[PDB]
Amino acid sequence: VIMATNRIDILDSALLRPGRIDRKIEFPPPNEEARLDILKIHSRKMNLTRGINLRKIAELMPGASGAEVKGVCTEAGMYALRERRVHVTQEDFEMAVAKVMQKDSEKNMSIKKLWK
Amino acid sequence: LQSVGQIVGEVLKQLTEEKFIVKATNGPRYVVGCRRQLDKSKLKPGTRVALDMTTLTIMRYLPREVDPLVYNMSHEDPGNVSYSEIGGLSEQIRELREVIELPLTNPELFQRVGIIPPKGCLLYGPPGTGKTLLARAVASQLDCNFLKVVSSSIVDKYIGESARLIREMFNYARDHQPCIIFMDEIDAIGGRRFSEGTSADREIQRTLMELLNQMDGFDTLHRVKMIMATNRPDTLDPALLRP
Amino acid sequence: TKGPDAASKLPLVTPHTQCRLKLLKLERIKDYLLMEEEFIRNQEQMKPLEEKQEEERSKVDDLRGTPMSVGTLEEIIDDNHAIVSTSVGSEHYVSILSFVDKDLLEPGCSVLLNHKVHAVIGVLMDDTDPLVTVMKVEKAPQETYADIGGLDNQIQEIKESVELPLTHPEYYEEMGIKPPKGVILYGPPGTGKTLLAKAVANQTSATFLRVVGSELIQKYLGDGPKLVRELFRVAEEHAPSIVFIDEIDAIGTKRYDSNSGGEREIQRTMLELLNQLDGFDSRGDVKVIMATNRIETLDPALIRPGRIDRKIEFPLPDEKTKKRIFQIHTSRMTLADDVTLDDLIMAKDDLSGADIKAICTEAGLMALRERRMKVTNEDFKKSKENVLYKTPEGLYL
Amino acid sequence: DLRNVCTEAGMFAIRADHDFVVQEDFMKAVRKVADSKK
Amino acid sequence: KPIRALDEGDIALLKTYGQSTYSRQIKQVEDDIQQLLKKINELTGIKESDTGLAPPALWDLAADKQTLQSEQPLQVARCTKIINADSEDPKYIINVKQFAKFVVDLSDQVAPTDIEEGMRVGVDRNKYQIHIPLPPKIDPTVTMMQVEEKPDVTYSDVGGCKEQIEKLREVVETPLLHPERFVNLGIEPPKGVLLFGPPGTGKTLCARAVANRTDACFIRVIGSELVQKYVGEGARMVRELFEMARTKKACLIFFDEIDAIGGDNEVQRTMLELINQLDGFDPRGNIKVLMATNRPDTLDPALMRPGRLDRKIEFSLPDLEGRTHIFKIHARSMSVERDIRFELLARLCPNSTGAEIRSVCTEAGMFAIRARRKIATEKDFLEAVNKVIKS
Amino acid sequence: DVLPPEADSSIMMLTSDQKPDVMYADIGGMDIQKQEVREAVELPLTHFELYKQIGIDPPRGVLMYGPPGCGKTMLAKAVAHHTTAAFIRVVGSEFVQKYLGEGPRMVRDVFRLAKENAPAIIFIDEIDAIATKRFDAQTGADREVQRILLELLNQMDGFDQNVNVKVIMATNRADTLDPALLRPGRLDRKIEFPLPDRRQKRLIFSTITSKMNLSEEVDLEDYVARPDKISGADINSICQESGMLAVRENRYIVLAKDFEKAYKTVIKKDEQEHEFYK
Amino acid sequence: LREELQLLQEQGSYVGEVVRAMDKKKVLVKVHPEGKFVVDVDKNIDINDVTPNCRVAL
Amino acid sequence: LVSNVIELLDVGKCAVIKTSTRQTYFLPVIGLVDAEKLKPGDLVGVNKDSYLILETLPTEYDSRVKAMEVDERPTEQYSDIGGLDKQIQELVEAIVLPMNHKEKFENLGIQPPKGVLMYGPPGTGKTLLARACAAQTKATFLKLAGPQLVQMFIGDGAKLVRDAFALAKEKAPSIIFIDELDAIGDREVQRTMLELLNQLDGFQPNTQVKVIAATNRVDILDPALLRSGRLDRKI
Ligand SMILES: Nc1ncnc2c1ncn2[C@@H]1O[C@H](COP(=O)(O)OP(=O)(O)OP(=O)(O)O)[C@@H](O)[C@H]1O
Ligand SMILES: Nc1ncnc2c1ncn2[C@@H]1O[C@H](COP(=O)(O)OP(=O)(O)O)[C@@H](O)[C@H]1O
Ligand SMILES: Nc1ncnc2c1ncn2[C@@H]1O[C@H](COP(=O)(O)OP(=O)(O)O)[C@@H](O)[C@H]1O
Ligand SMILES: Nc1ncnc2c1ncn2[C@@H]1O[C@H](COP(=O)(O)OP(=O)(O)O)[C@@H](O)[C@H]1O
Ligand SMILES: Nc1ncnc2c1ncn2[C@@H]1O[C@H](COP(=O)(O)OP(=O)(O)O)[C@@H](O)[C@H]1O
Ligand SMILES: [Mg+2]
Ligand SMILES: [Mg+2]
Rounded to 5 degrees, what are φ and ψ at C192? Predict the structure, then answer.
C-alpha cells in the first residue's frame, strides 16, 4: 500500500508506525540537475530553438518544485502562442520563469530587518 | 372520492422531449413521462412534481418546497403599518422609498435613466431607532412578499446549516418575486473576515460568503431590494460593505 | 452448551534450519494430512444412510413449506402462541405448531417461521449472522510466546487473566478472589499489544473472537447493539471463550450528550456492550481483552474496577527487552560475525518492537542492495536511520 | 422609549382611575421612563 | 551511489547458490500441507443444523393443518390515544413497530373495557381490528428487575458510611418500623430520597443492605436496561412492579443508576407514571422510593419538588476508619494472615473509592497466587495497593 | 435501458436560460485579465490545435484574486456567457454540508459531472471558504472543511486526471489559500485583479456611462484623473448614484452637480480618526 | 427475439448471501432487506458448491 | 391510516402529506373533511388505499409539550405565600385585574400590560407566587426555567417556547412563566433574548395567555425586554 501527503508531521503516530508504514519516502524539491531533467522531460514535445540552454533555465529556479517546472514549460509555450509562433526562445523561458515563480515578498523593509 | 392521490418528487433531468428522470421523495427514482396537456417548458430540473400513483407520469408541477424556518419567517404578518406612524425620518425614509420602492413601481424610469435598479441598502443606527418599523412600512406600502429576518437567528451549531438557510431564504425570494429580504442585526453575520481560526467565527465567514454570493454573485438578482439593519455599522465586512 | 473452537496445526519450528528434521516433521504432517483426506474421501465414497423416517419428515416439511423465514423469538405467550420479530423488525403474534421443542423456545433463539401465515415451525440455535461468524478465529495465528521478546510481566499478567482461570482455577476460589473478568492492554503503538493477542490466541483452549471495535458499529438502526449482543451470545454459547476487541477507543471514547441519531446509536452500542459486559458473571468462563493506544481517551466507566479490573501497561522496550527483540527478529537472518547489534540498542531512542522489526527488514533490504545475504553491521548502521525518520542540542547535557 | 412614555402614561391613567389622560400624567410618565433609562 | 536493480540473472542466482539444499522439498511439502488443509476444510461438510423438531408421536399434524388453515396470525402494536371513544369512536391510533400507525376499531370478541392506551394488542391483517389485548407480562426471568426478596448484605457488610447509614436510617427505618411517631407528630413520612454520589461509593450496596435490614424486598432497576431494548412498555412494566409492591407487604423500590433514566418521550412517560405512583399513590405507603445517581442535578426538576422527594443524601468517599473497615469487610472473604495491618493499607490508599479497595484486595489475592502461596501476606497487599492505587 | 453516465447528478448545470447576459464588451478594461482567463478557459476549448502544435498542455485552472468589486465574478459571468463549454457554477460555502462526508461527496460529484460532460468549466466563487490554508484542525468541523479541501486537491490533480475540465476559482484573499492549491498543475495561473489604474478607470467609466444618458459636457476624464483607490464596483456605484440623484431632482440628463454629489457620497472614507494615530 | 421476450417477462431474482448450507436440501441465506430465509436448492445447483458467504440468486 | 399533513398548497387547496408509511403524497382534493383549520401538521386519518382525508383527529404531542405535563391546579389560596402582601396585590393588579376589566382597558383605547418583571435573591419564592397567581386566576400554568434554557443549545426559542405558546393558545386560559434571572461564545443568549422579544411581540395581542418573568437580580437588564409590553410590571 502506498500513501501520499504534504503534512506527514500531523499524521497519526499509530499510522506512521513502522510495520504499518515503512520506508517513509521523502520527495524533496528537485535540485539543479533534477530540475534540468524535469525541464528536458516536459519540453520534449515542444518545438525548441537551436541555442536553447535549459541548464540556465534550471539554474533560474532555486528551490522550485517539479510542478513549477512543468508550469514554466507551459507558460513559455503560452508566450510562444501569444505571438502566434511555434518556436520557444530562451527569453520566453526566462519570462515564464519570472511569471511562474513570482511570489509576494515582505513589502515592509522594517519588518524584514527585525532579524540580523 | 373518485380521486386517488399522487406521489410527489423532484425532476432530475430531461432525458428527451418526453422521458424525464424523476426522483420520488424518500424513495426510488424513475424515468417517467408527462401528461399530454402540460407546460414541459416549465419542468426544469429540481422542480417538485406530482406523479400518478399507478402509471407514474407527470401529473402536475408543484411550488418548490419551502423550509419550515423560511415558512415561519415568511408568514409573519407585517400588520399593514402605514407611513404616518414613523415620525421624523423624512429624508431617510424618502431615500429608502427611492432605493427600494422605485424599482418596484416604475422600473422603466430607472431603465430610461440608464442605470441598474439598486440591489438593496443598509439602515444603521442605535437600537430602538425604527429601522425595523421603517422597513416594515416599506413592505406594507409595497404590498409585496416580506421576509423578516434577524441575523442572530440563522446561525446554527450544525456546520453547514446557516449558509444553507441563507440559500433557502434567497431561493424563496427568487421564487416569490417581488420580495423584500429584511435581515436585521446583520453585524451578527457580516462581522468582518479574519483568519484567527476559531470554528464559530469561521463558520460565520462561510455564512457571510454565502450571503455575498446570493446577493451579488454569479446568479444576478431581478426584483429580488433587501433591507439590512444593524447597530454596529463599522464592524461590517468590507466586501459586504462594498457597493 | 457446546465447546470451544480455533483448531490450529502443529507448531513445528522445532528446527528452523531446514536440516531435514524440518523435513521429517513436515513429512509426518503431510502424510497424516493425506491420511485424513483418504479416510474422509473413502468414507463419503461408501456412506449409505438416508430416508428412514421420511414420510413423517416429509409431512412435517410439507407443513413447514418453503421458504421458512427465520425470526427472533422476542416473547412467549401461553404455550400455543408467541411473539416473534421478523428480521425486518416487525413482530407478530403467531401460533407455535405441535412439532416444535417447547424446551428450546427461549427469548432470543432464532425460530423458523412459515412464509405465509407466520407460525413457529422450528428453532435455529446456530443463526450466527455472517458478521459474528467472521469475527471468530478459525486458523490460529502462527505467532507464539516464543516469538514475543520481553514483556515478561505483560505475558505473566495476561496469562493470569485469560489462561489461569480456564486451566485449573482452584486457586481463585481457594483464595476467595473472583477471576478477572476482562483485561485491557494499553501503551504506545507497536509495543506488542496485538502481538500478545495473537500469542494468546495461539496457546489457547477457548473460543477466540477477534473484534476490530469499529466493526461493531453498523449503519442500520439497532444493528450495532444487536451485533454486540449476538457476539457475546456466541461467546457464552461457545464458552469458555475469549473476546478480543482491538482498538477499543474506536467506540470507548468519552460518553457525551448525543444529538445526532448516529451519535445516539454509537452511544447505544457502547451502552449495550457495557451492559453485556456486566451481564455475564466473572465466574463465567468468557473473558474480554481490549487493546488501545489512547488509554486516556477511554470512557471511565468501561475501565471501572467492577468491570475491567486489570490494566496491562506496555512501555516502550528497555535495553534488555530491545536486545531480546533483536535476537528474536534476527534469528532467521544469516548475520555476519562482525555485526554487534549493541550499537543500535545503545542509541537512546524510542525503538519499539515494530521499529526493531522494520530495522531488521531494512537491513536485509540493504544487504540485498549489495547483492549479499550475510548482512554486515554496516547494513544495520544505515538501516537504523533509514527507518527512523525525523531537545535543542545543548539544553539538557 | 417615546412609545413607552405614551403607553405607561396610559398605564398611569388607571392608577388614579381615569378614562383619559392629563398633562401631569404624561410628565410623570416620561419621568419614570427616564429613570428606567438611567 | 546509483544502486542497480537486481537483474533476472541476479534474481536467478539469489534463488540458488545461497540456499539450503532442502529449500525445494521443504517449501513444496509445506505448500501441499496448506493445500490439504484447504481440501479437508472444503470437503469436511457442515452437518445438519438440527432445526427444532420435537420427538415423534408428539405431533398433531392434522390439527396443525386445522390451525394453519383456520387460526390466523395477528400483528402486535403499541396502542395509543383512545380518540375519546365513548362507544361511538371505538377507533384508536395503533403503532405496529417500524410499520405505520392506523386508526382501527375493535373486534366483537373484545370489549372496550379490556382495551386502554399503551398496551400491546394483537391486530388482524384484513382490517387491523384489535383482536386480543396482549399484556407485556411480568416475569423475573425477563427484563432485569428486583430479582431479590431478601438481599444477602446486612449492615455488617457496609462500612465507612456511618453518618451516611445513619441518615438512611432516619429516612427508612423510622417511618417503616415506627409509623406511630409520625402519626402522633402529624408529619408525612419522607416521600422521596436521592442518594447522589460518585460511582463505586456504595450507594447501590448501602441501599441493598438497608433493604435487607428493613424487612422489605430490594428492587433493582437498571436504567440502561429500559433505555435500551426494553423501552416503551417500560411504563407499564414499572406500573406492574409498583402494583406488586402494593400486593407485597413492603418493597424497597430503588432504581439503580438512575443517571440513565433521569437524563425523554417514553422516559417522560415513565417518570410521569411514577408521578402517578408517588403523587397519585398515597404518600403513606411502605413502598418508599430510593433515588441514586452518579449525576445529582441530572434528575428532572419536577421530580425533587417538595411532596415528591423529601431528602437528598450525599455518599462521599470513605475516610480512614471507613477505608480500614471496608478493607476488613472485603478481606474476611479472603485467605490472608491474621496480622494484616489494615490501618496501614487504608492510610496508603487516600481518596480511594470502595471499588478501588475491593480491586486492591483482589489484586492482593492475585499476587498471592502469583507466588503460588495459599495465604496472602502484608507484602502482597502492599504491592497490590502500589499497583491499583497510584494507577 | 442504460442512461447517460451522470444523468441523476445532484448538482445542476447551467441551462441556456440560466446563462448570464454579461458579455466581454461590458467588462471595461482588464485586457490582460481577459486574455489570461481566455487562454486557459476559452482558447483551449476552441483552438486545441494551437496548443497541440506547440506541444504544451493548456493551463487548466485559473485563480482570480484581488480586492473586492474588481470584476472577478463578472469575468466568470462573461466566460459563462461566451462559452460553448459545460459550465458548472458553485460557491465555496455551498460545498460545506451539514452531514459528515457530504461535502467531499459533493466535490466528487461536481467534478465527476464535469468529467462525464463535454469540455467543461467549473467555477467556484469565494474559494477561501473551503480552501483556507491547512492547519492542525482540533475539531470535527475543521477536519471536515480540510477534508473538503483535500478532496478538491485530489480531484483537480489526483491519480486519475481530468481532460478538458478547466476550473475557475475566485477569492478576495489569495494569500490565505493552501499552497497545495496554489501550485502549477492545479491553479496554473493566479490572475491578479487590482483596483483600476487611471486608464482602467477611464475604460470602466466609459463602458458604464455608455447606456447612461448624456452627461452634458462633464469632466469624466477629470473624475477619472482624480487619484482615488476605487474599484470597478465603486465606479458602477458612482454612476448609479448619479442616476438616482437625477431621478430625485427630476432631470434625466446628469451633470457635474448631482454627479459630484454622487461621487462624494460613494467614496466617503470619512476618517473619523483621532489625530494621535496620524 | 421471442425467447428474449419470454425471459424478460419473468421476475428478477433476489440476490442473497448464504449464511450456511444447513442441509443437503436447505440453505440458510440472508437477502437484503427482506431478512434471512432458509431456502431450498433446485435441481441444477449442487449443494457442495454453495459455500458460506457467497452470492446466490433466489 | 394516520398521516402528518406536511403543508397545504393553493391551486382550491391541495395538501401534501407524509403518511406514517414514510411516504409523501399529493392530494388534489382534501378528502371528506373541511379544509379551513387544517394546520400544517394536523394529524389526519388518510385512506389506506386511495389516500384521501376521511377525518381529522386531535394532535398527538409536540415533544416537550408532552415532556411538560402542564399543571392546571397549583393549589395555593394566597394563604401559602406570606410576607409579599404589597407584591401579591401588585401581582393581582398586574395580571388578573387587567384581565377581568379588559373592557375598561379598551375604553381607555390602550392595550393591557403583557408581562411582569420580578426579581429577588435566589431563594425568594418567585416560583410559588407564580403558582399562587395561576391558582387564584384558575388558569392553566406554563413554566420555563432560565438555568434550564442556558444549556440545551439551539432550540430554546426555535421549537420549545413558540410551541409552548401554541399549546397555550390551544388550552386557554394559561400563564407563561420564565423563572430565574437567566442571562437576560455568548451569541446563543443573543438568540434567546431575540426570540423572546420578537415572539412575545410576534403573538396574539389580546394576551389571553399571560407571561410572568421571575428573575434573580436587577443587574443584568435588557432594555428591549424591560420595556413596555415585554415586561411592564416590576415586582
Ligand atoms: N516484545 C516484542 N518482541 C518481538 N516482536 C515484537 C515485540 N513487540 C512488538 N513486536 C513486533 O511488532 C510488530 C507490530 O506490533 P503489534 O502489532 O503488536 O503492535 P501494537 O503494539 O499492538 O500496536 P497497535 O495496536 O497500536 O498497532 C509485531 O509484528 C512484532 O513482530
Ligand atoms: N420614528 C420612530 N423611530 C423609532 N422607533 C419608533 C418610531 N416610531 C415608532 N417607533 C417604535 O419602534 C418600535 C419598533 O422597534 P424599532 O425601533 O422599529 O426597531 P429598531 O430597534 O431596529 O429600530 C415600535 O414599537 C414603535 O413603537
Ligand atoms: N461503605 C462500604 N462498605 C462496604 N463495601 C463497599 C462500601 N462502599 C463501596 N463498597 C464496595 O464497592 C463495590 C461496588 O459498590 P457499588 O454499590 O457498585 O457502588 P455504587 O454506589 O456506585 O453503585 C462493592 O462490591 C462494595 O464491596
Ligand atoms: N471592469 C468593469 N467594468 C464595468 N463594471 C465593473 C467592472 N468591474 C466591476 N464592475 C462593477 O462591479 C461589479 C463586479 O463585482 P465583482 O468584482 O464580480 O465582485 P467580486 O470581486 O466580489 O467577485 C459589477 O456589478 C459591475 O457593475
Ligand atoms: N415567602 C415565601 N413563601 C414560600 N416559599 C418561599 C418564600 N420565599 C422563598 N421561598 C422558596 O424559594 C424557592 C423559589 O426559588 P426561586 O427564587 O424561584 O429560584 P429561581 O430564582 O432560580 O427561579 C421556592 O422553593 C420556595 O419554596
Ligand atoms: Mg497493535
Ligand atoms: Mg464576487
Answer: 130, 20
> What is the C-alpha to C-alpha distance for residues C97 and E60, in angstroms, rounded to an integer?
9
- In sequence order, the β-bridge partners of residue B29 are B23
Q: What are H50's three cell numbers?
A: 386511495
Residues of G within 8 A of C129 (CB-CB) are 19, 30, 36
Q: Decide: B46 and H63 in contact? Cβ < 8 Å.
A: no
User: Coil, helix or strand for H49?
Assistant: coil
Q: What letter does residue C97 receive in the DSSP assignment?
A: P
- Which of G18, G23, G27, G28 would best serve as a mutation to test chain E binding (most E beta carbons within 10 A)? G23
Would you state the cell numbers that stand for residue E18, as one nine-digit string? 545461497
Distance CA E154, CA C50 (A): 63
Crossing angle of the two packed helices A66-82 and A32-42, in degrees rounded to 10: 40
Q: How far is E108 from chain C (nearest CA, A)?
A: 19
Cα separation values, A61 from A32, A64, A72, A96, F179, Å: 8, 5, 10, 11, 18
- The answer to whether the Cβ–Cβ distance between F59 and A74 falls below 8 Å is yes
The DSSP bridge partners found for residue H69 are none
Peptide bond connecting C240 to the previous residue in cis, omega within 30 degrees of 0:
yes
The residue assigned the cell 470512557 is C299
Query: Which residue type occupies C393?
Result: E
F149 C-beta neighbours (distance < 10 Å), count: 26
CA gap F147, F188 in Å, rounded:
22
E315 class by beta-carbon count within 10 Å (0-12 exposed, 13-18 middle, 19+ buried): buried
Closest partner CB to E93 (pick from H2, H66, H67): H2
Q: Is C194 a pocket residue for ligand 1 (Cβ < 6 Å)?
A: yes
Helix axes E320-331, E354-370, angle to 10 degrees: 50
Q: Which three cell numbers stand for residue C278?
A: 456486566
**Strand order through the sheet with F86-91:** F86-91, F120-125, F165-171, F62-65, F189-192
Short-list D18, H102, D38, D2, CA closest to D29: D2
State residue C284 phi and psi, 5-degree precision. -65, 155
> Residue E331 CA: which ligand is closest?
3
The protein residue whose alpha carbon is closest to atom 6 in ligand 2 is B130
Strand partners, A7: none
Give chain A as a 3 state SS string. CCCCCCCCCCCCHHHHCCCCCCCCCCCCCCCHHHHHHHHHHHCCCCCECCCCCHHHHHHCCCCCCHHHHHHHHHHHHHHHHHCCCCCECHHHHHHHHHHHHCCCCCCCHHHHCCCC
Chain C residues within an 8 Å CB radius of E44: 40
Q: In whole angstroms, give the CA distance from residue C298 to residue C249.
A: 6
Question: How far is it, in rounded angstroms, from Cα D12 to Cα F122?
Answer: 67
Nearest to A2 by CA among A23, A27, A28: A23
Provide the 10 A C-beta neighbour count for residue C392.
5
Distance (Å) from CA F72 to ligand 4 centroid: 7
Resolution (A): 3.2
3-state secondary structure of E33: helix
What residue has cell string 396470525? E73
Determine contact, residues B62/B8, Cβ cutoff 8 Å: yes
Query: Please, are residues B15 and B45 in contact by the beta-carbon 8 Å criterion?
Result: no
